[PDB]
Every structure is written in structure tokens, then in C-alpha cells.
Design a binder for this molecule. Sequence first.
Ligand SMILES: O=c1ccn([C@@H]2O[C@H](COP(=O)(O)OP(=O)(O)O)[C@@H](O)[C@H]2O)c(=O)[nH]1
Length: 711
Amino acid sequence: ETHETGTTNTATTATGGGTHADSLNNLANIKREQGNIEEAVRLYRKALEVFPEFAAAHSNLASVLQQQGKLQEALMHYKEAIRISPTFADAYSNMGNTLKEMQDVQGALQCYTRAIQINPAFADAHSNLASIHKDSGNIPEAIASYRTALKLKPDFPDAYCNLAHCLQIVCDWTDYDERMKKLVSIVADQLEKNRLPSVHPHHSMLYPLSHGFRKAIAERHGNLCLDKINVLHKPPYEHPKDLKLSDGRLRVGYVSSDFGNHPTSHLMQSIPGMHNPDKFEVFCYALSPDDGTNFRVKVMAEANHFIDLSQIPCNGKAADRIHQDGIHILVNMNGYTKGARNELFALRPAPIQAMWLGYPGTSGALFMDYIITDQETSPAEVAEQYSEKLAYMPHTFFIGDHANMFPHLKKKAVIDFKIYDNRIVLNGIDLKAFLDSLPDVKIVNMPVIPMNTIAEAVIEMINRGQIQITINGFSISNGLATTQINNKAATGEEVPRTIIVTTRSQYGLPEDAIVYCNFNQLYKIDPSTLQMWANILKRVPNSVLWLLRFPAVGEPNIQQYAQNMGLPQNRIIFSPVAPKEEHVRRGQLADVCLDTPLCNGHTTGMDVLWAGTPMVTMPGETLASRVAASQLTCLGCLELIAKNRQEYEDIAVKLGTDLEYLKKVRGKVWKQRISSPLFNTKQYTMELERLYLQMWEHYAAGNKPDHMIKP
Ligand SMILES: O=c1ccn([C@@H]2O[C@H](COP(=O)(O)OP(=O)(O)O)[C@@H](O)[C@H]2O)c(=O)[nH]1
């Protein structure tokens, strides 16, 4: 689940009418462009007092009311505009944008297609329709509609920028360098003319925008929330100045749209219950309804308090609830992601408000005080990228729930088909008892099942695509068929009950060569990165690159570019996206993971390391380009971090060419995923608590936020 693509409202210039009403409407349009929203509203309402049946003024007013979050009142005016003027295409397109924001995709499509039916040359409606295709996952149709819009209106920043991100999703790098310069130039122009930047904050990390531009895009996006809360005219809240009402406990509120089957929960679902109740009182504020999964069950049971704000959709009232609960530190787990209701933070119901874990960037906004990070991810020298003060965790700010979700991957055994650690692999909770039932098993620690009757039967189950067999009373599962056996084991909601078998043959990977993997969404790849990967493959004779169809339509673009850099097609192998458990388990088949420098694996980096797979990374400047080095520093593998592209290629080549070195580094990862802090949620929670108390003490003594960066 991605964010919703932004749309373009069309301001209608009034002509041919009474001078007074036309002038009021047109000047109102200008005041709206300048960010004088209230004054715009006053002017459209004067225009309507002068000429009650003024279709343009109804539609333009509705467009500013939509900006203010007054969606139902906006719809009322759009409909009045269309009643007065049934072929008013601007009003249908604008109404479309309002319906989209209300999550009525069908209504939005009905409005945009009506607009286009009225006026086929209406660029903005084509662009808005494009945004629906983009959000549906129909990239080729989104690209087509954005191209139509740009053909009709060649200077069209929202269309251009949303097109660029469509192209990024499918690794279309046609005219890439010129495209990157153009995005920078658009953003420069919009920041100068004080118009909302067409690059979304979350996407800004992918383009060679300056840090100040990235921060400024973030800020301007935060400012949208201000326009929505300003109409509530709510006074500042009075905050606790001590812990007396909470009996000496710090009240921490975790606000997320992701308490359910979402990557954020896959990272931090154990944290609420690990909080120490003698000093901390945990409130979890869900922005989404209960999705039925055990992720939601666990957080509901373990948190001291759970509060469903999806049932309190008015932001003023939701913020009042947070304030009534007495929260000292309110934690924004969303940032600029779908489901966020950053208006809640803009209302400042708590005295300390911190960004944490869910969003890999700055809010840019005055209403957030701190970003929870660490010295590797966010060295003080690069503080300019963030509006918040830095608040350092002692190792990495990243965490994962892999030890609780995937304990079956803490140990493995192999079958010696013919000794490799990653060709044919077994994992399971009863694996030890299964192996004790085979009298001929030998220990390397990694148990090895020799080629014997039992091993042949296992390999036969895999070769034939059978679901499972029973040997010696133990169920032995095909790793491709987990969802047919237990759907909750496949999603990570429960620990699998069978012994699962995972093989290179299941994914068409070679038995006698090095497998380099990357399991991120393809948008994280750029031309430099694929050239680096080709250089590595070229230096490691029969090695392959294992990527995902994420999405499948990017595959022929990656293959063509790879061919142009001298790789044959057979050197890159694509697999489908898998269920969570399979995705983590099958990383055990790779030799090495090659991290994406543009935007690293985050969740995906923790996934690969839980399998014992060394990851090679090159940290950049942005928070999103530095997370994997931070994970690796915490893990205790500094030799896997490159300072430049030559070193990343050399590290990866050496891992694929010196097999003793490979085994040594693999063994470090395998061991340190348990012995290091990286996956230790109890330790993590204890250090987060100390950080929270540093925040609180500083506030309680009467200070504004400061960087909390002391080694
Ligand atoms: O084959 C796959 C590949 C990925 N994932 C999961 O898909 C999500 C990818 O989210 P995102 O692209 O946000 O990951 P990040 O950017 O954090 O690495 C993560 O939860 C992965 O564990 C999956 O379940 N199956």
C-alpha cells in the first residue's frame, strides 16, 4: 500500500459576466494561489452574494473548501455549479478530486470521464484520471493519460512529476538524466513561486534534489494540514508539566494507520508490550479499523491502552481524545504515507511530538519536535535535511519483529544432494526432533541430511510440486505451498507448524553458482545501480542476480538495460512477490544481497539479514540511503559498507569469488543476528525508554527541543 497520488484542481477564470462578480472571483483565485485561503473564501462568498447563480464562483469556492477539508460543503457547491451549467467540465473534474479524497474511486472516475466526455482536450481531467490508474496499479494506463495531459498542456508540473514516478516504478529510464534535471527545475520554480511542489515528500528521496528542497517539499506538504485545522479555531492545548497525574509514569502515545498486517507492525508489534509498566504507560492510537489479523490482536492485548481513532474521524475530536488521555510524548509513525492524519499532530495535543520508524524522512513541519534516528543513519553534519531535532538511539533506530515472527528460521538443516548452506534448506520448530529420528544425520552448527531414502522422498515432493509429505510422524511441507497449509503461517501471523523445505530449484536458481539478490520494489533501482550490479556479475563468472516482479511490467525494462551493459538475459532471474514468511525464508537461498544505494532496503534489509544473508550497501546522504549501513553497523559487519561504487563492487566480487571469505562473513551474519542488538526488541524498547526520558526531562525543566546526540 502506497500513498494516494495528488490531483490538480482547475481554477475557472470568470469572463463575460458582471464586472463586480467577475472581479471578485478572479481576485479570489489569485488570493488562493498565494496561500491567502481565508481571504479567497471571503471573496468567493462576496461574489455569490452579488451573483447567486455564478457557476464559476460555486466551483472555485468548493475547491478552496476542499483544501480546508470541508468536503461535503464543497460537493454541495460543485453540484450547484453543474446545475447552473451542466457542461461545466472544470466542476466535474474538481468534484472528481473531492470524491477521490473521500475514498469514492468510482464516483471520482464517473466525474473525470464525464469531464473528458464534455471536453476531450481538458488536460487537468486527463491528469486526474491518470492518478486513479496510478493508484489502482495500472501503470501503463496512468502513463498514457499523463502523456495525453502533457500533450495538451506541455507545462504541467503535476502531470510531469507523477509521470516521472510512474516511469520510476517500472524502471523506464528513457532520457533519465534530462528527466532528473527537469524535476529539479520544476521544484525550484514552484518553491520560488510559493506553489505546492508536484514532487511528493516520500518520492523526493529518489531525485537529485538538494536537502533544502527536500525539506521544503516536506514543509509545504505539512502546511496542507494547517489549512485543515485552522478552520477549527481550536486554542492551544494545556499540557502536563510533570508526571503526578500518571503516578510517575510517562504516557507515550503511538499513532499509526498500520496496526494490522502492515510492514510497520512487522517491525514493532512487540514494542508496546515490552514497555516497562512501572515507568511507562502506553497508548496505541489506531488510525485504521481492525483488519482481523493477529498483528492487531497482539497490539490490542499488549498495549496498556488501545484507542481506535478510525471511529473518531473528526480531527478536532480525535486530538481532544489524545489530550484527555494525558499524553506526554506522541509518536508519529506515518509521516507522509497513506492513512496519516498529520492534522492530529498539527493540533499539538501533546507537549513532545516525535517522528519514529514508519516514515524515512523529515516532516518538515513545526509541529513535530524530534526524529528518532541514530548517528549512522543521521550524522549531525546532515541535520540540515531535517526540521526536527535529532534524537539518537544508541545503535540503530531500525528494529524488526523477526525473532518473534520467524523463530523457525533461527536454525536450519540442509540436504547434501550429491556441502552447501543454501541449495536445499529445511526449517521448522520440530526440526531437531525430526533430525534425531534419522540415524544417519551428521553435524558441521548446521545438520546435514545425507542423500538417502528420506532425502530422495523430500526432493521428489519438491520436483513434483506436492504440498507435503509425512516422514516419521513429522509433516514436511513444500515452501511454495504454505498458504494451502496454514494461511496465518504464510502471512507471519503464526509460526509455521511443519518442517518447511526451500530450494534453489523451486525458483530456477543455479545449483553451482553465486546468487546475488535484491528483494525491494523495483522503483529503488536506477541506472547507476544496475550498472554497478552488471559490473559485479561481469567479474564473478557464472553468478546470477535474483530480483522480484515488483511489479512484473518492470522486468523487460531491467532486462533490456542489463543487455545493453553486456549481461545476457539468463544472468538475471525474476521471481514473483511472495507471502511474508516465504519471502524471509527464501532469502536463505541467496549468497549475498546487493542493497540499493538510491533508497536502501529498510524492512527488506532486516528480512535479508534474518536469513543470514550478508548485505552489501553504499550509504548516501538521505536518511533513506543510509538505513542499511546503520543496520549493518549495529549487526557488527562494517566490512559490508562501501564508501563508493568501486568499493561496493569490490566487496561484492570478493564475496562471490573467495568462497572461504563468503562462508566466514555468512557465519558472522548468522551468528550476529542473534548476538547483536539488531533484532533484540527488549533491548530496543529499553533504550527507547531512556531516550523518551531524556526528551521528557529536557521539557520538564522548561526547555524547547534540542538535539539529543551525545555519544
Ligand atoms: O516477496 C516479497 C517481498 C517483500 N515483502 C514484504 O513487502 C514489504 C515491502 O515494503 P517496502 O517496499 O515498504 O519495504 P522497505 O522499503 O521498508 O524495505 C515488506 O514488508 C517485505 O517484508 C513480501 O512480503 N514478499
